């Protein structure tokens, strides 16, 4: 499929899209991104995750090269262009200089745009399995460009879904997603002061509060895994994905559970609420 | 000169080389470089340097896409176009893919040389204030291109020459520097589980061997500042670097010290043991 760029007023093929080796994003790892998703050709919680990467470009010192507005008007009009389900990259790079004020003033920005790679309909049955490994995100409200760990991690993974990020025994999230503890019918997933705020977790908490369902926001542990009856992990692309075996330990019956199916289908029935 | 950048066979002027935003240093922070300096135009440890890129390269799954040997090469044909001191930053990136093999197998490279950037002579006889703060570097054996942190920790560092990562008291590194405290006439420095193996580090070992002072290999304590008589900072470009204040406490009688002085007069009256 024909994948873009948008860099520097244009929307380029992808394949010819470049960035000045000057940039800090290559030099030091200084960048900030998103990952929005569509259903129907239109972008899944636009504006949250536009205000994310706000906060994320704020939180790392980077001045902002667009308004959210513009970034905005760029995905829409990418998105036209690509005519398909599209996952959807806008990057907020450190630019060329840390200036006097601390500051990273000339940022540049670039969206990238690829036909969407859904998880294969075999995940959503079987359910995946998670390594876990003793390591975090530091800062981990910014979503940063540095994913070294998520690769590195996968070095003796021998071939599970997802890394899980489980610090000293407690789960916070996995490399690409929230995760999600079911232990006698409540939600346990850890908080925002150790994972990143999800948009798919804030439509997760939302659905289980229009559901009755209890929410714990504290770490799930590791020790906890054999009294669990289910687990899943949410992002976008993924939405609610089952995860049936963490590291050596079965999940429950070692199947897809009915709650984690369940808030699965009440996300795919109400999507077009989150829809801009 | 001309700051340059040697990319795909050729010596370009270092604002004109360019990077295809396909490759996992820009999407993911896939990347791992070395910082390398001249003294008379001859690269200071540059095997040293070259052996610790593949050890990097190695440690983050990246199949390194030139031989030592070659990257030897490009250093040198470089500092002799630049025709002056020279700091010299080999880079390796991820490229467009994490293979099946779990490797990044079409790695690019990339070498950046600009005219060296010494700290100023005032920096040397006053010494330079540090400000700590509460984390550290993940993975400190690896140099990747992950140096987000060393720009936002700066965010109310309020003018300090640099960074020092001081996870739970304990002092590891600075953000570009190994860290020594000077203690009863010995030297404390972290050992090499918490903190990179610097060059300088390895050198200043060597230099501390000759002159039959001690070094003990544990982490320094911000609550043991108050008992010490000196401090240093070590690294590629700063060679030893006093330092005199660490967040609101100074060190000793707050100037350089008399075993830092000395370690770095033995440090350039040797430096070509260890010219290339
Ligand atoms: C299946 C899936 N789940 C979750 C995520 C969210 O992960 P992050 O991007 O926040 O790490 C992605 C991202 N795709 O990103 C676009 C495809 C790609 O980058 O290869 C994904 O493809
Ligand atoms: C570290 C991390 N945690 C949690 C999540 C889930 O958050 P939402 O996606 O629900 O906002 C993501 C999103 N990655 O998205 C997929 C990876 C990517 O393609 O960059 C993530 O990168
Ligand atoms: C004064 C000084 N000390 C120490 C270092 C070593 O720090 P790392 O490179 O390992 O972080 C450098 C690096 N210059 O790098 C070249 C100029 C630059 O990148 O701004 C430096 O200029
Ligand atoms: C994080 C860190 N620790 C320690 C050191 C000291 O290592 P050596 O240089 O002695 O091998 C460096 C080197 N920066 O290199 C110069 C500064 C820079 O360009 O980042 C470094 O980046």
Redesign the pocket.
Known sequence: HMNLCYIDGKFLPLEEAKLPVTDLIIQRGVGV???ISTHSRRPLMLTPHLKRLEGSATASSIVMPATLDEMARIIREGIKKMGCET?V?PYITGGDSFGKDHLFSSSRYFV?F?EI???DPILYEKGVALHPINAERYLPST?SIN?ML?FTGQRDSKGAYEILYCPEGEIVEG???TFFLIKNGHLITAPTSRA?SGTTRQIVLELARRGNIQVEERCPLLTELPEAEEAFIT????EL?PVVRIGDQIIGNGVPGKLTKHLHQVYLSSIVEWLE
């Open positions: 991104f998103e990952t996952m990259r990238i690829e790679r859904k998880p979503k994913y998520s490399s690409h997603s990143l992002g976008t692309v993924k994905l």
